[PDB]
Amino acid sequence: NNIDFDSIAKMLLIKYKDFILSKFKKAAPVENIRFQNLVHTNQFAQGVLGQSQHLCTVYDNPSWHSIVLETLDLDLIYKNVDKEFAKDGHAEGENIYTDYLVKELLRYFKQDFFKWCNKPDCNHCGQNTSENMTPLGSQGPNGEESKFNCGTVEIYKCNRCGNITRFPRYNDPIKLLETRKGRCGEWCNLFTLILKSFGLDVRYVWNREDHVWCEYFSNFLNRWVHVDSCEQSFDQPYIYSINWNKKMSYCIAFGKDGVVDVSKRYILQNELPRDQIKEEDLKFLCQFITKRLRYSLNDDEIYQLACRDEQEQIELIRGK
C-alpha cells in the first residue's frame, strides 16, 4: 500500500468541524433537565451558576467602559506603552503590543491608580494612619452606601482621635473609581473591567479559598495569561500555589465567552480535596453554561472558539 493521508486528513477536519458545530448547535432538552436538577442537587454548582450569571456579562456596559476610559489617564498609559514598545518590541512585528499594554495597565494600577486598604486610614485623623485602628466589627451598609453594591461595611475605631472610620466593601466598580482603595476583592473587580474597557479578552478567575485575579487572552502568545493586579504580576500562574504555598481546591474562570475550570493551571502542588461536585458533573456544568452563553454567535465565531477551547484543554491536561 501507500495510503493517502492528505485526503484522509482533509476529510477528517471537515467531519470534525461538523461534529463541533453540533455540540454548540441546539438546546438539548435531555440535558436541560439534568442541568436544571443538578443545580438544585449541589450548591457549589449553584455557586458557579450564580457567578456565571453575574461575571459573564456585567462588565460589558459600554456605559461603564466609557466612564473608565474618561477617568483613567490614557495619555500617560500609551505614552509609556510606546516608550516600552520602542525599547525592544519582543520577537516578530506582531501583537506583542497589546501585552505591553496590559503589562503597563498593571503598573499604572499599582504604582499609581489604586491604593491598598488593610485597615482604612483614619479619616478625621492624619493621612497616613493605618496602624492605630482597632477593628470594632462589621455591619450592614448605611444607605448612602447601599446606593452602590455593598453588603458589608467594616468599622474601625481610631485610637488616637476616638472616631469611627468606615470601610464599606463595594461591588460597583464605578464607585470603586471614587474610593481608590480596596483589598483583593475590589482590586480585581475594577481591574477586570479596566481591561475589558480596552476590550481585550478577559476572564475573572475565582479561587475558592478567598482569591481572585484575572486571565487575559494574548494573541501574541495566544493562550490565556494569568494577570493579577494586586501582585503587579504578568504571567505567573504558579505564584499562589508555590511561592505563597496556597492550599487550593478549585479555580474557575468566567468570561463572556465561557466558564471553564482552570484549576490545573494553578493548583499545581498543595492540592486540596476536590468535591462539592462529581468531577465530571463539573465538566458538564461549564460546557453547558458556555453553550447556553453562546447561542447568539454565528458559525465560525462558534467553531473558532471551540478551537481555542480544545487548544487550552490540551495545555492544561498537558500541564506544559
Binding site: F5, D6, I8, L12, L13, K15, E310, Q311
Partner: protein, 57 residues
Amino acid sequence: GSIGLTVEDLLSLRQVVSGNPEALAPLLENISARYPQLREHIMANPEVFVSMLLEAV
C-alpha cells in the same frame, strides 16, 4: 478492540486538528507508521478510522 490509541498521541492528534490543521496528515501518517493494527483499518476503511477519533474528545 475500540480505537486502541495512546493517551499521548490521541492528545497530540486532537491538538493539531484544533490548532494546526495544516499538519494533520503527516501526524495522521506517522501515527499509522506506528500502529500496525491501524495501518490495517486505514487501508480497509478510511471512514471508520475517522469515527473513533472525534469520538474521543
